[PDB]
Amino acid sequence: TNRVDVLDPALLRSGRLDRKIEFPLPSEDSRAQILQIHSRKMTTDDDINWQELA
Amino acid sequence: GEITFDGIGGLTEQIRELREVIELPLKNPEIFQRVGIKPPKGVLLYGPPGTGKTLLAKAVAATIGANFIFSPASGIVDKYIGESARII
Ligand SMILES: Nc1ncnc2c1ncn2[C@@H]1O[C@H](COP(=O)(O)OP(=O)(O)OP(=O)(O)O)[C@@H](O)[C@H]1O
Which residues are the signal sequence here (chain A)? Predict the structure, then answer.
C-alpha cells in the first residue's frame, strides 16, 4: 500500500503484519544500478557514462 | 487444543470479573437466590486492539467444559432475503 497513515489499527500492529518494511527512494548510487539493468534490453554504447546520469 | 488459564496473565482481575457472570450462576444459583437477585447474563468485552480480548475468550472456552458456539459476527450474513434471520 502507498497510504499507510490511513489504515486503521486493527489492520496493522504486530501479530497481523509483524514486519513493517519501508521503501526509500533510490539513493544517488542506486540510480546508477537501476539505469543499467533497464538499458541492457535495448541497444547501448560505451559513449554513455551512467555515472553522470545518476 | 487447550490453552492454559494462567497462560493469560497480567489481567488476573478481569478473569475474575468474567467468572462472576459465567462460572458462578452455572454451579451455584443458590447464592444468587439468597440475596434475591436475578442472575446476570450478557458480557461485553471491549478495549484497545490487541489487548487480548479474544485470547481471554479462547482460554475460558477450552477450560469450562460447557457446550460452546463460536461465531465470527460477519460470517452469518447471507445474500438471500432473511436467510441471515434464520441462522441467529
Ligand atoms: N494479556 C496477554 N498475555 C499474554 N499474551 C497476550 C496477551 N494479550 C495478547 N497476547 C498475545 O497476542 C496474541 C493475540 O492477541 P489477541 O488476538 O487476543 O488480540 P485481540 O484483542 O483479540 O485483537 P483484535 O482486536 O484484532 O480482536 C496472543 O496469541 C498472545 O500471544
Answer: none
Quoted resolution (Å): 4.1
Rounded Cα–Cα distance for residues B78 and B55 (Å): 28
Ligand 1, residue B53: give the atom nearest the CA: 21
- Grid coordinates representing A10 are 486493527
For chain B, the DSSP string reads: ----SSSS-S-HHHHHHHHTTTTHHHH-HHHHHHHT-PPP-------STTSSHHHHHHHHHHHS-S------GGGG--SSTTHHHHH-
Which residues in chain A are contacts of B49 at CB distance < 8 A? 9-10, 13
Phi, psi values for residue A38, rounded to 5°: -85, -25
Contact B59, B4 (CB under 8 A): yes
